[PDB]
Structure formats: C-alpha cells, structure tokens
Design an enzyme around this catalytic site. Sequence first.
Site, PDB file in Angstrom:
ATOM      1  CG  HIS A  10      -0.839   1.447  -3.207  1.00 24.43           C
ATOM      2  ND1 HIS A  10      -2.120   1.208  -2.763  1.00 24.43           N
ATOM      3  CD2 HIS A  10      -0.418   0.292  -3.779  1.00 24.43           C
ATOM      4  CE1 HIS A  10      -2.453  -0.042  -3.034  1.00 24.43           C
ATOM      5  NE2 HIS A  10      -1.438  -0.620  -3.654  1.00 24.43           N
ATOM      6  CG  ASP A  17      -2.233   0.682   0.943  1.00 24.29           C
ATOM      7  OD1 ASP A  17      -2.190   1.931   1.057  1.00 24.29           O
ATOM      8  OD2 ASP A  17      -3.295   0.049   0.708  1.00 24.29           O
TER       9      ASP A  17
END
Length: 391
Positions: free
Chosen positions: A219, A196
């Site tokens: 991310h 993430d």
Amino acid sequence: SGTINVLDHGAKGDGTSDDTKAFEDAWQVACKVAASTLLVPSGSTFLVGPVSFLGKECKEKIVFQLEGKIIAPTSASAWGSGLLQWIEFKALQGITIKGKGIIDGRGSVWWNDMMGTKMPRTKPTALRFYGSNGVTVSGITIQNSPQTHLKFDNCISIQVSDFTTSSPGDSPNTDGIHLQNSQDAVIYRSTLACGDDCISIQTGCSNINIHDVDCGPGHGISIGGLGKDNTKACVSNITVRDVTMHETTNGVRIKSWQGGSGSVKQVMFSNIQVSNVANPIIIDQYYCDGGGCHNETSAVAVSNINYINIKGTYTKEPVRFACSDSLPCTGISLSTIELKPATGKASSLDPFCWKAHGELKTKTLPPIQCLKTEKSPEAASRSNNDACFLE
Ligand SMILES: *[C@@H]1O[C@H](CO)[C@@H](O[C@@H]2O[C@H](CO)[C@@H](O[C@@H]3O[C@H](CO[C@H]4O[C@H](CO)[C@@H](O)[C@H](O[C@H]5O[C@H](CO)[C@@H](O)[C@H](O)[C@@H]5O)[C@@H]4O)[C@@H](O)[C@H](O[C@H]4O[C@H](CO)[C@@H](O)[C@H](O)[C@@H]4O)[C@@H]3O)[C@H](O)[C@H]2NC(C)=O)[C@H](O)[C@H]1NC(C)=O
Ligand SMILES: *[C@@H]1O[C@H](CO)[C@@H](O[C@@H]2O[C@H](CO)[C@@H](O)[C@H](O)[C@H]2NC(C)=O)[C@H](O)[C@H]1NC(C)=O
C-alpha cells in the site's frame, strides 16, 4: 565457545518439535557473555512459539545470527488470545539480528481464519522490538507474517538493511515495517512485498530516513493513520529518497483521521519512481478505513511537506491533497513531478486539492493548479507547535 548454537541447548531443528524452551535457554547463556552470538544455524528449521528475549536481566551488544529458518506454530493452542507479537526483543542495548535466514509466520492460517473459535481483528506481529537503544536488523527475510512483519516500538537508533518482507499482496494488514515512538532510524537497501503499507510511521516518530528501498506489492510508504479515536499524533523530520514502487495502492501517503490532533511536519519525499501505482501522491485527512467517516473540528496539522522528482505511471488519482476544513494543510511544495496515466480511466482523473496551501516550484505533469498560494490564518490559529515539538 563464543557462538551459542541453539542445537547445543536442546533445539531439535526438525520443524515439528517445539523448540521455544531451547531458544530461551540459549538466550540465557548468550546473555551472560559480551560479544556473544546466538546462532540459529543454516540447514535446520525451528518451530518456535511466542517468545520474549528480555534484555532487562541480559547483556548489551548481543548478536542473534539467523541463518536457518524459524517457523511459527499453526495450532491455536500455541498462541492463547490477545497476543500482539510472536517474537519479541525487549529492553536491549545494541542488539543485532543478522544473517540470511528466514522467519516464516505461516500467516495464511490467520489471514484465512484457522485459529480459534474466532479471528482477532489484530493478529500477531512477527518480529517486534520494544524499548531498545541501538537496534540493527540486517540480512533476514520475514515471510507470511500473521500481521505486521517488523515493528519498532519506543526504540532509538535503529538500522534496517538488506532486509526483505514477502507476504501476498492480497493478505490482510500485513504491513512491512511499522514504527511508533521511535527516533533516529535508517531503513535502506531493502525489498518490501506486503499486503498493506510497506512502511508505516506512526505517532511519536522523528528523524526517520528511508532510502534505496523497493516496495510492491503493498500500500506504499505511509505516515499514519494518525489520530484515530480522537487522539493526538506527533511526527517530524521524515525523509524518503530513492525508492521504487511497483503496483502499490499508494505511493507516498500521509493519512489522518478527522478528530485527531497534533502535527506532522517536515517531510521530504524525493526521487520516487512509480510503476502502475494507484494513488502516487496523497495527503488524506478524511481517512476512515475501519471506522466511521464523519467529520470533526479537530485535525492533525500537516505542514512543510516536500515532493521532489516523482515520476512514473499511475492507475487512479495522480495527486490528492484532501486536507481538513478545520485546519488546512500548509507548506506543500512540489518540484519535478512527471506522472502519466497507465489506463484510460486514470487519464480522466485530474489532481484534487481541498484546503491545501503551498507552491509549485516547477510545472508538473499532470498540471497541479489547485494549490493555494495565500497563507492560511485558519491553520496558523490552531496551536500545533509546542504540543508536539521542542525545537
Ligand atoms: C466531510 O467534509 C468534507 C470536506 O468538506 C466533505 O467533502 C466535500 O464535499 C463537498 C460537497 O460535496 C465537495 O465540494 C465540491 O468540491 C469540488 C472540488 O473543489 C475542488 O476542485 C475545484 C476544481 O474542480 C476547485 O475549484 C476547488 O477550489 C475552489 O473551491 C473551494 C471550495 O470553496 C475553495 O476553497 C477554493 O479556493 C476554490 O475556490 C476545489 O479545489 C467543487 O468543484 C464543488 O463546487 C461546485 O459545486 C458547488 C455546489 O455543488 C458549486 O456551488 C460550486 O460553485 C461549484 O460549481 C464542490 O465545492 C468536496 O469535494 C468534498 N471534499 C472532500 C475532501 O471530499 C464531506 O462531504 C464531509 N463528510 C461528511 C460526512 O460530512
Ligand atoms: C532530521 O533527521 C535526520 C535523519 O534522521 C537527522 O540527520 C541525521 O542525524 C544523525 C544524528 O542522529 C546523523 O548521524 C546522521 O548522519 C544524519 N543523517 C543524515 C542523512 O544526515 C537530522 O539530525 C534531523 N534533524 C534534526 C534537527 O534533528
């Protein structure tokens, strides 16, 4: 004498016996002497369950020297329900975690639904600092976290250096470093491989400096998501410089929820190199991962956001400034942006601007011709000054 080795306090170091009790006992000893070091020695692996190292009844300036490996239990019975953190340090002054050892959360048992009759949406953070002043994390690696690798909550004067995360790019919600209500932090010379956000800056954070960091997978580096469930968020004075991002889903992102309120102000993203990054530059005030995607009349006010010297290749939209209809973004500045599409698909996607005001200081590749030069009475009319900031 001054170095408290956990093996001298009952720890088995065999990876299989539960050493939590021994670690708590060693902590109690280390807490009584200043300049003391609790050593988790190299050559040993320690199974440690949920544990909280409390500073309230402890001493300040303690060193937790992690040279071996700490591993999390994989049995559901070790965890109970609703536990938000595995290892916690709470209410410490001048705590240092250092060494070249490893925290391994064995996170695949959680990502992969092997705990309990039921998976919790939020799984434990591997290492959390709460309420601490003067926190240093250096040298260590956190791998395979159940969820977030390293969290700072209500901490001031933070230094993270020579630090590594390692969880698979497709693991769920395994953000690298998360900060909330934290101030005066420097994160540098670190390598973040995450499932993430590599770095996530949440509300209440100010004076955060990130430099000389490699991200990917992950991310990207994100402020937000801010303002979920109609809440107020305040973030200011964030600097990100000299960062390389490889195969991340975003580069430098600010994300906020419709219905949020507050302010994100004074952010500098500079000297960023991107390699096969899907969305290198993004402000998204329509963020709604994990909730509803409706619009609302409140927004977090985004202003004075600077992008300088951002270059490399991208795989989806190169630049997206999607700001709220009810509170346009203002003071966006771009300089020295040279982004090339990595795929044909990417080459067909132009920059997207919606309700975004600012200036181009140089020509850019691709050209960004959608930023509005005029001022926004709409943005200025929403009170997002004294609700969040004193200066
Ligand atoms: C929640 O709220 C969001 C935000 O409103 C909704 O999402 C928006 O949906 C609308 C409608 O579907 C989308 O509108 C289209 O936007 C494009 C893109 O505009 C942008 O890019 C243009 C270049 O491609 C650029 O010219 C635009 O700037 C001009 O226009 C804006 C709008 O007035 C203005 O502010 C500027 O000053 C410029 O004048 C802008 O940067 C646009 O091309 C579309 O317009 C064409 O089509 C319409 C009608 O179909 C036509 O009338 C126009 O003249 C033109 O030919 C259209 O405006 C918008 O992209 C969405 N925004 C986001 C961020 O997603 C969302 O639907 C709402 N959700 C819910 C659930 O309610
Ligand atoms: C904006 O944030 C920066 C980085 O946090 C602050 O500058 C740092 O301030 C500390 C004092 O806390 C100095 O020791 C550091 O040397 C500074 N770092 C750098 C890179 O300069 C700055 O103070 C913040 N601005 C305001 C107005 O608070």
